[PDB]
Nucleic acid binder design. Sequence first.
RNA 1: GAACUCGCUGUGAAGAUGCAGUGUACCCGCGGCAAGACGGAAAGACCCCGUGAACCUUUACUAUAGCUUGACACUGAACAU
Length: 54
Amino acid sequence: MQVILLDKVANLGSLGDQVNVKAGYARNFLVPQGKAVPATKKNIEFFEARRAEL
RNA sequence: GAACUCGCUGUGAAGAUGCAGUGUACCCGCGGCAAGACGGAAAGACCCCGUGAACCUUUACUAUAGCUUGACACUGAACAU
């Protein structure tokens, strides 16, 4: 779903963009194995500050 | 059910110990034999009814467990023909 990436994962990733992917690829691979974070409307404002400040 | 509980012919819910006619018979036991009293025993089991019941059977009706087909969800990413 609306998950935001953090890693060099293959061609849907650009070090973090909101994509439209299925929920099966969301959980257990992106929801924690690393490499991403769920977007439960709290991380879309927290990691947005990580984009601007860094 | 009660009886002081005879046989005939005929009558009769159509096979009479009780009716009618008639015949016969002292009163009362006991030992016997089963002919009858449509004997006793079982609201006939056979048969037919009841818009009875019960099971069982099937290409009766309508359901359903299970089996089976497909879709969605659990369930993904890359691709290619």
